[PDB]
Amino acid sequence: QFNPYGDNGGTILGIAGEDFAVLAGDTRNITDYSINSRYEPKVFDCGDNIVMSANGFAADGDALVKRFKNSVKWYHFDHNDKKLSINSAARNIQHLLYSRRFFPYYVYNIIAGLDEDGKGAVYSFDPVGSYQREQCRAGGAAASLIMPFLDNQVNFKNQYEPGTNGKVKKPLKYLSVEEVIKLVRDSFTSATERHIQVGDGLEILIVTKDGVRKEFYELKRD
Amino acid sequence: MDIILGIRVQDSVILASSKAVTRGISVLKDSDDKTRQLSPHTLMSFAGEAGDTVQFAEYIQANIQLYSIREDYELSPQAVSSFVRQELAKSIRSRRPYQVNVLIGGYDKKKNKPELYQIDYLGTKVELPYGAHGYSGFYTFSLLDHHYRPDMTTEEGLDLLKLCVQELEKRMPMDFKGVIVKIVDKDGIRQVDDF
Amino acid sequence: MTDRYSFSLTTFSPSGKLGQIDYALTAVKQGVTSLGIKATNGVVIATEKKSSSPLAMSETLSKVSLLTPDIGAVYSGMGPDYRVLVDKSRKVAHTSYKRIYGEYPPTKLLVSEVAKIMQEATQSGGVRPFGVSLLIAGHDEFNGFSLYQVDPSGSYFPWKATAIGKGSVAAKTFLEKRWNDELELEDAIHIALLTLKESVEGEFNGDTIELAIIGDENPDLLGYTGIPTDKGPRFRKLTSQEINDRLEAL
Amino acid sequence: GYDRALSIFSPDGHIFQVEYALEAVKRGTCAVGVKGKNCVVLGCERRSTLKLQDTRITPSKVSKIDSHVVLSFSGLNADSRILIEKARVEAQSHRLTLEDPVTVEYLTRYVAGVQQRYTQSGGVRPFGVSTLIAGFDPRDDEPKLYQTEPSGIYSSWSAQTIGRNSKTVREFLEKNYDRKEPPATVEECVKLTVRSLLEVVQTGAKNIEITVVKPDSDIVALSSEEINQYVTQIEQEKQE
Amino acid sequence: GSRRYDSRTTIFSPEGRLYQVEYALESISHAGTAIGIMASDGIVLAAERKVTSTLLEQDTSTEKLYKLNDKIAVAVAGLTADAEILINTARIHAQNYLKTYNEDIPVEILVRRLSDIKQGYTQHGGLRPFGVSFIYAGYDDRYGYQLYTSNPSGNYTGWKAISVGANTSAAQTLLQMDYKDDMKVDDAIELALKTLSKTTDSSALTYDRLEFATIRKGANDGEVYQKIFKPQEIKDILVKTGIT
Amino acid sequence: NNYDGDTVTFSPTGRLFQVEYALEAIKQGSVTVGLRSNTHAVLVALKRNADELSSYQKKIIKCDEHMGLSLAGLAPDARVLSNYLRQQCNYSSLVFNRKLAVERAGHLLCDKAQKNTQSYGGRPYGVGLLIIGYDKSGAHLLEFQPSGNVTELYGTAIGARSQGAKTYLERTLDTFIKIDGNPDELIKAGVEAISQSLRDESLTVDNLSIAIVGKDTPFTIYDGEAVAKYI
Amino acid sequence: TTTLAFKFRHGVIVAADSRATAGAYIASQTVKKVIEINPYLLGTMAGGAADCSFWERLLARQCRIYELRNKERISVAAASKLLANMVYQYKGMGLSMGTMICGWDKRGPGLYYVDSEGNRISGATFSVGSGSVYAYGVLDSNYKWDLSVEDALYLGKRSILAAAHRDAYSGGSVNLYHVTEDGWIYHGNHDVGELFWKVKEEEGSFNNVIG
Amino acid sequence: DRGVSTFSPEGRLFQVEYSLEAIKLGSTAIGIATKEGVVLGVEKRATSPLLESDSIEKIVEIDRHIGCAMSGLTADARSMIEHARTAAVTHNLYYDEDINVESLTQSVCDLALRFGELMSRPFGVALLIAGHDADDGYQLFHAEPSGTFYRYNAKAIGSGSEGAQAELLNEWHSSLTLKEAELLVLKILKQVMEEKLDENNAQLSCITKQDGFKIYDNEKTAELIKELKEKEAAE
C-alpha cells in the first residue's frame, strides 16, 4: 500500500525579542537512518519582512511555503502593494492549512517577523491551521528537548529570586539579539548531541526593521 | 436517546419520553423534550443517534407545516405517518442514513379517533394501541399486554404509564431521569406538568 | 459549437394556427397514396412503390415495415422521416414495454408512443415536425384487430378504413361505399387493390405495389418449434407473385 | 439551456419587458391595503364577469404565507402562485434555520429579490405581478404593510392600492387617510377599506373581499353578509 | 448566430399580454365544445367530437374525455397530442401523492400542479405553450364534488357549470339561464346535452359525434363511480332526453 | 452595415466590423508610449481624469517582477487580460521555475483575444496594450491589438493622437536604442516622445505616469512627485 | 482541556484553561480557548484546536453578515444553530469539536452546547473537555441563580482549578469572561501554579497537598 | 435582433451606454470627502404621501468603515451590496483586518461586465462608495456599470448631477470641515430637488474613523436644515 507521507526530520526554533525576531533551523535532511543532504535550507525569506519554516514532511513543507510566497505576491497585486502584516499572514496560513483538513500538510509551521507596533513576533501552527502567537517556540523532531530549556532561560520558569525562597519570582527582563543567538546555538548543540536527526549545520534568520539577515553555524556531522 | 413510549386510549394518545441527554460518562441535561409538534393534532416523539434525531424531526415538522399553509388544511395522522415512513425508507439506502426511531401520536378530527404509529429507522411502519422503541418495550410490553383496554380513559392510561415507568426505573441499569408526558386529543396537544 | 437552438421553431400565429404542423401536413398531401382497411379476421395496409429510377432496385426500399410481430406500418410523405420513426418505434416497443412486461405492446399503446415522439418534434427546441402521416395496423389479445392513423401533430385516430396522401379524398369516398362490418380478409385485400388502382398512373403489378396484412398466426415464419404458446407473427408481407394472383381475379 | 436575454435596456434607458409587466398589473383586479392603529386590512376586487363560479373552491385572492403574514396581489394569477410558493418555502426555511418566524420586512425583501432576479436573468421574463404584503412581526404590535413590483423595488405604506383603477382609490386614500390619527379600531379600518373599493368596484355584492389581520397570528376573512352590512351603512350615510 | 430565428415565445406585448398564450386560446376556440356541470349528487362531463367520419371506429376512440384516476376525470379542448403529454403527467402526480400520503389526491392539488406546469412554459424555456384547455371533474372528502378549468396561461378557476372550446360565449349564457343550485345529476345530464344541441355547428346532434361521462355517488353506499358512456349508452340518453 | 451585428460574421470584402469597432475604442483612449534600449524598456502614459474633483485613471499595470503593460481603451478589459498575464507568468514560475519570455507572453495574449473573435455570443476585447519586459534575451517591447495581432517593436504609441509620438520615435530610432546603462535619459526620450501627442493640456505632476524595467531593475511604476523630476 | 459556562441573574460566566497537548507532550500552555465572535457573543474550544478555531471564525463572519442584512444582532439560538448545521454536513468525516455559544440577546442571557456529533442543547450550566467531570462537582454544589458577579467569577475560576489539578491534560492558566447585557468583559489570565497555592491558603482546600 | 455584448461603431458597448441613461433618471445622490470624514446624502423622492418615507433605503452600510449611496434602478443594487458585504467580511475572515476601500470598490466593479448570452444585462444603477482605511485615509469612489471606478473629492450622481457637479466644482476645497460638508450636501440637494427639502424626503450620512459609518436621524438632519436656512439668510 502506498503511503503518501514521509518524515524528513529536522528541527526549528523561533524566538521573539523586543524589536527583533529570529527563526532558526538545522540544515539536515533525512529518511529513516540515511542522510539526504547536510545542507538543505529549511527557513525562507517570504517577503514583507516575514520568515517561514514548515518542518516535518519536506514535500508538504515546500508546497506550503511556495503557496504562501505566492499568497504574498497576489496580496500586493490585489491591494495596491500593501505590506502584509504578520498577523494577517498567520490568518492566511490558517486557511491554506485547513483547505486540506481531510488530506493535511504534515508539517509544523513557524513564521516570524515584526508586528504593527515594531515589536518582535513569532506565530506557531499545527498541521491543520490552529495558530497562536508566542514569545518562544521550538518545532520538529527535537522540539520536546528544546522547549523546556526555553521556558527556563527565556521566560524564567521555576526560577525565583534568592533569599525570598519561592515568594518572589525572577523578573521578566527582555533579551538582546546576542543573548538570544547564544540560547539558539546552545539549544541546537544540545539537541544535536541527543537527537540523531539533528546535526550538520544551523542556519539562523534574524528579522529587524532594517531587514532580514542570515547567520550560519556548523554542527556535528555524526 | 433512550426511552420513548406511546399508548392510544379511548379518546387520546399519550406519549412518554425520557429527559436525559448523555455524552459518554456524563449527563449533559436532565430536562430534554424529545418531541416536535408536526401539526395542532399530531405529535412526534423520537430517539436515535445525536444530531440525526433533531435534524430529522425538524425537517419533517417543516414539511408538514408547509403543507398546512399551502392547503389551509391539517393532514391526517395516517397521511403524516406515511410521509415520515417514506422519508426513512428513502434514507436507509442513502449515503448516510438517519439513525432515528419515531412514534407518531395524533387525533384524527375527521374520524374522531386517536391513532398511534410506530416507525423505526428502516421505514418499518405499524399502527398500534401501544408501542415503544429500543429496550423500552422489553420491560413495558408485559404490563401493557396485561392491563390495556381500548375503552380506557386518559387518567387510566396515565396510571398504567406510571406503572410502566416504575418498572423501567427498577430494572433498567441506565438512569434516564424520568419522562415528559404529553397528551394528544380533540382539543390539541398539552403537557402533563406533574409526573 | 453547441446546439444553441433551445427555443421552439413551431409557434402559434395570431390566427391560432401552428404553421409548421400545417406545412408538414402539406408535405404529406404531396406524398404517394397509402391506405388501410380493417376486416373481421384481419387488417390490410398497402401503398405504391414509386421507384425514383428503373435502375434502382425497389425491393431494397421497404415502405411497409414490421414494428412488432403483430404490428405493421406504412406512410405517406417524406421517406427518410418515416425510416427513422420506424427505428425509434421498434426500439421504444422494447425499452418502454417488452423489457418491462415481457410481451409486445398492444397496438394502441405503441401508437401512443410513436405519437408522443411526433408531438415532441412539434414543441421541443431546434427541431421541425416529422413530415409524415403513419398508418399503423396491428393485433393484440384483448383489443383484437385495429388500424390507427398518426399525423405530424402527434394526434392519432382509430379507423375502420382510411387513406392518406395524394389521392386520399377520392380513396376515402371509394372505401365508404365498399366497407362493411362483415368483410373477410380476402375481401379487404380485394377492395384495397381496387382502391389503389385509381391513384396509380403507370404499371400496376406485384413489383410496383407493396402490400402487407395483419391476420392469422404464421408458425412457418416463427423460425423454431417446441413452445405451444408461441404460434408465430401475425404480420405478413405479401410477395410479388401473391399480389399478381389476386390481380387476375380483379 | 435557453439563455436568451429578454429583459434588456433600450436607447432611452428603459427595460421594456419590466414596464410591460407593469401593464399586466394595471389589467389585474384592484387590491387595497390599509393599516390601522392595531390592525391591517386587505381588500380585493372580484370581477363579476365570471358568474356560475364555485366560490368555495376558487383560489382566494389573499394568501397566507405564514400564520402571521399574508400576501395579496394584482396581475397575472398564474405568476402569483410561483411567488407565493417560493415565499411560503422561505418562511419555513427561515423558521428552520434561525428559530424565528420571518419579519414582514424580511419576507417582502425576499419576494422583491426574486422579482428583481427575473429582470436580469437569461431565458426568463419578469413576473407580471405586484404584491401587497401585510402582517405583524413576532412579539410586536406595530402593523406592517409593504408593496412590491416587477422591477423588484419595495417599500412600506400607511395605505396603498394596486391594480386596475388603482389611481382612483389611491386618490381617495390620500385625502381620507390621516397619519396623525389612523383608524383606531377594526371597524373604522374595514369601513375605510370598503369605502375605497366602492369608488371602483361597481356592485357591493360578491365583488368585494375583505381580510383582517390582527397581532399574534389572528387572521380572519369576512363573509358576504358581514361585508354587505358595511356596504349598507356607507350608502345610507351617503344619502345626505 | 441562432438568435436570428428565435420567435421569443415568453414575452409581454406592449399592452401586458402574453402573445403565445392569447394565440393558443385562439386555437382552442376552434376546438370541439366541452361542457361540465356540477350537481349536488354528482358531476356531468359532455363533449363534442369534431367533424367525424362514418369509417371512424368510435367504440375504441377517445379524443375528449380522459381518466386521471378513479375519482378525477378531464374533458379536453385543443391539441389532443399536447393534452396527452399533460394527462400522463397528471396521472403520475396523482400516484406520487397516493404513494407519499396513502390517500387519494385532493382535486385542487392535482389541478394546481398541472396549471403550474403550463405557467412555466409562459415564463421560461423559450418553448411554445400547450394549446390545451381542461375541464376537471372530480371528488374528494374535503370539498366534495368540484369543477375546475385551466388554460394555456396556467390560470385555473372553480365552477358550478362551465364550457370550453368553441361557442363558449353562447354556451355559458344558456348554462347561466337554466342552472339552479338544488339541481340533480339527471337534470344536469339533460342541461348539458340541450346546451350542446343549441350551440353545435353541426346540422344535428347524434350519438356518434359525442363523448359523455358522469361522476356519481350513485354507487353502492358511500363511494364514487366514474362512468365513461359507451356509444349505445349515449344513443339511449339522447332518446330519453328527447333530442333524437 | 448588415454584417456588424456580431463577431461571427465576415463582410463581403472579408472584414470583421465588431473587431474594427473594438479597435476604435483604443483610438478614443488616452495616449501611451513605449520604447526600449538594449538594457532597459520604458512605458510612458498620459493619464486621463473625469473632472477636477476626480482622480486620474491609472494606465500602467504590473504583471511580474520582470514584466508589465500600459493600457488604452476599456480599462476593465485590460484588468482581465493583465490578470491572465499575471497567472501565466505565475504558472511559468511555479511549474518550471522559469521567468516567462515576453515573446511567449505576446503569443498567449494573441490566442486569448482570437477565441473571442471567432465564437458566437462573446465579444472582442476593447483595449490595446503595450507590454514591456526584460528576460533572458534582453529588453523587449510588444504592442497588442484586440484583433489578436501582436508585434515586437523598438518603440511605439497607441491611443488618441498617437501618430505624433510614433513619428518622433521613428526619427529618434538610432539615438534612443543606444541609450544603454542610463535609465533617466531613456525616460527623458519617452517623455519627449509623448509630448508630441499633447494639445492644449501639458504634463503635470498627477497627469504623468511612467514605468521602467531593465537589467538590474525590477518593474516599477512612478506616479505623483516621483515624476516631477521629468517634467 | 477544561471549559465551562453558566447562566445566572447577572448574565453568563465563561471560563477555560490554556493547555494544549500532543500526546503526553505539552505543546503549549498559553492557548486561548475562548473565541470572540462579537462584543456580545463568545465561543469555547474543546477537542480539535484547528477545527474549533476555523469553524467558529467562519460562524463569526456569518453572524456579521446577518447584522448587515437584518440591521440586528443575531440571537444566541440562531448563532448556535448555524454552527450546528455547518458541522452536521461533515458528520462522520472526522471533525472533533465541543463548543459553547454564550451571549446576551433579546431573550436575556443565552447558553448553547454544540458538538461535532450533532447535539445542540440549551442549558443553564455546561462543562466540556477531558476535565469537565472534575469541574461539574464544584459547579453543581455551589451554583445558584442569585449569585453575585464576584462570587460567580470565583466559582468558574475555582471550578477550572479543580480540573487543572486532577486532569493531566488540563492546566496552565485560567481565562475568565463575564457576559453582560452591555457586552462581554474579560476578567484576566490567572496562572494555575500561582493560583493553586493562593486558593489552598485562603480557602484551606487541597489539604492533602503540601506547601 | 442584436447581441447584448455588441460594440457600436464609435467603440462603446450599446448596453452599457443605455444603462447610463437609466441612471440619469434616478434620484440624486451626493458625496463629499474631507480630512475629517466623508459625507453621503440622497434624495428619497417618494412617489406618494402615503408611502412611509423611512422605509426608502438608498443609503446603505457595507462595513463599519465603508458606506454606500445609490442612484438609478435601485433594485439592481441589492445584489451588488450583498456581494460587497460578503467581500468585506470574507477579507476580514482571510486576513484579520479591514479591507481597503479601493479593493472593495474593485470587487464590486468586477461584477459589472459579467453579462452576455452570467446575468443577462448590465446593472442599471450607479454607486457612491465612501469609506476610510489606514493606508489612503478618507476616500470616495464612483462605481459605474461599465466596470470603471473613479476616485473623487466630491461627486454627484442622478438626475441633477451635472448641475450639482458644477456647484461642487466651486465649493470644494481641501480644508473643509465635516460640519461644512454636511451643510454643503444639504445646500446642493435643496437646489436640484423638485420638492422642498426637509428631514423626511432627504437623508444624510457620514463615515468617520472614530464612530464609523452612521445614518443620520431625521431629528439630527432637521437641525442641520434649520442651521442652513439661517446662514443663507445671514447675507
Ligand SMILES: *[C@@]([C])([C][O])[C@](*)(=O)[C]([C]C1=[C][C]=[C][C]=[C]1)[N]C(=O)[C]([C]C1=[C][N]C2=C1[C]=[C][C]=[C]2)[N]C(=O)[C]([C])[N]C(=O)C1=C([C])C2=C([C]1)[C]=[C][C]=[C]2
Ligand atoms: C484538552 C487539552 C483535551 O485534552 C482540550 O480539549 C484542548 C482544546 C484546545 C487546545 C488548543 C486550542 C484550542 C482548544 N485540546 C487540545 O489541546 C488538542 C488535543 C487533541 C488533539 N486532537 C484531538 C484532541 C482532542 C480531542 C480530539 C482530538 N490539541 C490539538 O488539537 C492540537 C495540539 N493538535 C495536534 O496536536 C495535532 C493535530 C490537530 C494534528 C496533529 C497534531 C498531527 C496531524 C494532524 C493533526
Ligand SMILES: [Mg+2]
Ligand atoms: Mg546528531
